[PDB]
A paper describes a structure:
The major histocompatibility complex (MHC), also known as the human leukocyte antigen (HLA) system in humans, plays a pivotal role in activating T-cell immune responses by presenting antigen peptides on antigen-presenting cells (APCs). HLA-A*30:01 and HLA-A*30:03 differ from one another only by five amino acids, three of which are located in the PBG. In this study, we determined the peptide presentation features of HLA-A*30:01 and HLA-A*30:03 through a series of structural and functional investigations. To explore the structural basis of the different peptide-binding characteristics of HLA-A*30:01 and HLA-A*30:03, we determined the structures of HLA-A*30:01/RT313, HLA-A*30:03/RT313, HLA-A*30:03/NP44, and HLA-A*30:03/MTB at 1.5, 2, 1.4, and 1.6 Å, respectively.
Here, we found that RT313 also formed stable complexes with both HLA-A*30:01 and HLA-A*30:03 through co-refolding assays. Although peptide RT313 was able to bind both HLA-A*30:01 and HLA-A*30:03, circular dichroism (CD) assays showed that HLA-A*30:01/RT313 (with a mean Tm of 45.4°C) was much more stable than HLA-A*30:03/RT313 (with a mean Tm of 37.3°C). The availability of the crystal structures of HLA-A*11:01, HLA-A*30:01, and HLA-A*30:03 with the similar A3-supertype-signature peptide, RT313, provided the opportunity to compare their cross-presentation features. Firstly, the alignment of these three structures showed that there was a similar overall conformation of the presented peptide, RT313, in the PBGs. Our crystallographic data showed that although the key residues at position 74, 77, 114, and 116 are different in the F pockets of HLA-A*11:01, HLA-A*30:01, and HLA-A*30:03, the binding modes of the PΩ-Lys residue of RT313 in the F pockets of these three molecules were quite similar. The NZ-atom of the PΩ-Lys residue had hydrogen bonds with Asp74, through a water molecule in HLA-A*11:01, HLA-A*30:01, and HLA-A*30:03. Similar to the direct hydrogen bond between Asp116 in HLA-A*11:01 and PΩ-Lys in RT313, His116 in HLA-A*30:01 and HLA-A*30:03 could also form hydrogen bonds with the positively-charged anchor Lys. Although residue 77 of HLA-A*30:01 (Asp77) and HLA-A*30:03 (Asn77) were different, the NZ-atom of PΩ-Lys also formed direct hydrogen bonds with Asp77 in HLA-A*11:01 and HLA-A*30:01 and with Asn77 in HLA-A*30:03. Although residue 77 in HLA-A*30:03 was also Asn, its F pocket was able to bind amino acids belonging to both A1 and A3 supertypes. The strength of the negative charge of the HLA-A*30:03 F pocket was between that of the A3 supertype and A1 supertype alleles.
Residue numbers in the entry:
A (entry chain B): 1 to 99
B (entry chain A): 1 to 274
C (entry chain C): 1 to 9
């Protein structure tokens, strides 16, 4: 039995254009644990991305926090690209400053 | 002011490539403090919180010795379980384990746990009595019989009631400045027009610890769940947590709604209005 | 600190 990830894309701190922050991609609720997570800037993968140590919730489903330092601007568009065995194609979720 | 210590482990077999991958993490309440990864170069249990780094080399030698033995035993058990189920060697499978203890404000043992899963479903777990097991299927009943013959429950219970609560007490003392803190949520509301007719009011709670929190929406003072939406609580990456709740409202009726935020770090609940 | 023994299944 397999379970598809939920995906949230957000900053660590309230976003202020030109100030240093952290871009987060939280993937959770998935099984099995093998997962591909890329953070994108204007469509291209951010090379320096770290992630938390693999852990899991009470229902046995896994969660991971992927993150990278960034300085947001007005026009730079960020997103999180997720691929998992349960997904036909990679799923992209855009960073929305208001979610 | 209750507290927990929990250790999680995940072993995944990799039939294409070589050996299984084993990752263990330890937590005190919502704060992770150790990790071990069988693929990592160090081959040591590693610190993941500042207040654990004051432990000396005997401690790190001990945790490394024990967690390496847990890793090796999981390897063996993936093969054993695959044989129990007559499963193909071509498939990748997962063993997950969670165990730990809860204590109250006085440091006294409240309860202890050990749960095992195979491919993300219950396999076997120590029961509430700390004396017997619940096996999820015929394969786990083989394990249960072995653990009964070995009197595993008694050895595990001694850890859960003893060793586990002692180290937890020590960690809560050594990390008191961060473990016994409460960061209250920083709260605000945002407003996002959907159409001329409708708008979304979003209630934010940011930078709080512990992760437990309640966000409630009301209309004219009456609780409101219709047209609500709650996101899962999520880590900020800095050891604090975030959550928001939203409601879709008729344009021009925003003023009637209130959001309510309850958290351990707030003396009184907070009320927000647009 | 972790429990010292994990058991074969």
């Amino acid at each position: 039995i397999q379970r598809t990830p939920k995906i949230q894309v957000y900053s660590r701190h309230p976003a202020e254009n030109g100030k240093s922050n952290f871009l987060n991609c939280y993937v959770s609720g998935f099984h099995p644990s093998d997962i591909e997570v890329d953070l994108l800037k204007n469509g291209e993968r951010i090379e320096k991305v770290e992630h938390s140590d693999l852990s899991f919730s009470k229902d046995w489903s896994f969660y991971l926090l992927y993150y990278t330092e960034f300085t947001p601007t007005e026009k730079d568009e960020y997103a999180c690209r997720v691929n998992h065995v349960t997904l036909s194609q990679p799923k992209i979720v855009k960073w929305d400053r208001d979610m | 002011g209750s507290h927990s210590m929990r250790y999680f482990s995940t072993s995944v077999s990799r039939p294409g490539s070589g050996e299984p991958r084993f990752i263990a993490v330890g937590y005190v309440d919502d704060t992770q403090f150790v990790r071990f990864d069988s693929d990592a170069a160090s081959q040591r249990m590693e610190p993941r919180a500042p207040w654990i780094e004051q432990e000396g080399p005997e401690y790190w030698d001990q945790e490394t010795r024990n967690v390496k033995a847990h890793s090796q035993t999981d390897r063996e058990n993936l093969g054993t379980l695959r044989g129990y189920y007559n499963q193909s060697e071509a498939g990748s499978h997962t063993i997950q384990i969670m165990y730990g203890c809860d204590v109250g404000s006085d440091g006294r043992f409240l309860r202890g746990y050990e749960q095992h899963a195979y491919d993300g479903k219950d396999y076997i777990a120590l029961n509430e009595d700390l004396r017997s097991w619940t096996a999820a299927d015929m394969a786990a009943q083989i394990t249960q019989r072995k653990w009964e013959a070995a009197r595993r429950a008694e050895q595990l219970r001694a850890y859960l009631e003893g060793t586990c609560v002692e180290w937890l007490r020590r960690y809560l003392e050594n990390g008191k400045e961060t473990l016994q803190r409460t960061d209250p949520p920083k709260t605000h509301m945002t407003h996002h027009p959907i159409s001329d007719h409708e708008a979304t009011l979003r209630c934010w709670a940011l930078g709080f610890y512990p992760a437990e929190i309640t966000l409630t929406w009301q209309r004219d003072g009456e609780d409101q769940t219709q047209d609500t939406e709650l996101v899962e609580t999520r880590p900020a990456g800095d050891g604090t947590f975030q959550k928001w709740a939203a409601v879709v409202v008729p344009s021009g009726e925003e003023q009637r709604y209130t959001c309510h935020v309850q958290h351990e770090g707030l003396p009184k609940p907070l009320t927000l209005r647009w | 600190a972790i429990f010292q023994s994990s058991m074969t299944k």
